[PDB]
């Protein structure tokens, strides 16, 4: 059995909270509360010859809570920056906390990025390819996902796991 801290970073009303309750509880909350104090949830998945427990840190994304989130992110294994692709300044957003993360984080920490809320893509703003390719050049695990139809969620997760 292995066991990762992880951690959720981004804009506020990107998807964080609905995509660790999606993983976590099967949940999704059309209507879900601004994350005011981060909260935290665990899951474990099953892999080809090991258990992975995930202890997650869901963080605020409003910008007055930016000095909490390196609480957060010490010592994290992984690190998933959620955007919401009808939102370019998200994505901008997420890039910058990407940077944090390569600067302040551990050296070692796997980061994933989510383009989130895949199932809006009639209302796109951030091109698929363009995103792949800033996650390639940045050393980035990236997927498309939906906590509302679950798209890629259990996927990203266990993309993670795997490079635990
Ligand atoms: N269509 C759609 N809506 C989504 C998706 N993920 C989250 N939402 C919606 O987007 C809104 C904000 O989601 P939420 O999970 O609270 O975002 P957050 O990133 O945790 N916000 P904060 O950082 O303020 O806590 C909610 O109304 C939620 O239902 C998705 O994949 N698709
Ligand atoms: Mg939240």
Redesign the pocket.
């Known amino acids: 059995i292995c066991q990762f801290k992880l951690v959720?970073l981004?804009?506020?009303?990107?998807?964080?909270?609905?995509?660790v309750?999606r993983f976590v509880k099967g949940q999704?909350?059309?209507?879900?509360?601004?994350?005011i104090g981060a909260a935290f949830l665990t899951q474990t998945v099953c892999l080809d010859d090991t258990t992975v427990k995930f202890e997650i840190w869901?963080?605020?994304?409003?910008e007055r809570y930016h000095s909490l989130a390196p609480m957060y992110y010490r010592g994290a294994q992984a690190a998933i920056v959620?955007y919401?692709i009808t939102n370019e300044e998200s994505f901008a957003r997420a890039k910058n906390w990407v940077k944090e993360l390569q600067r302040q984080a551990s050296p070692n920490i796997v980061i994933a990025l989510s383009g989130?809320?895949?199932?809006?893509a009639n209302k796109r703003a951030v091109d698929f390819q363009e995103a792949q390719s800033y996650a390639d050049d940045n050393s980035l695990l990236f997927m498309e996902?939906?906590?509302?139809?679950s798209?890629n969620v259990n996927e990203i997760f266990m993309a993670i796991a795997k490079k635990l």
């Open positions: 959720l981004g804009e506020s009303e990107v998807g964080k909270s609905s995509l309750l999704f909350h059309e209507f879900q509360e601004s994350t869901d963080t605020a994304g409003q959620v919401d989130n809320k895949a199932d809006l996902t939906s906590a509302k139809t798209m």
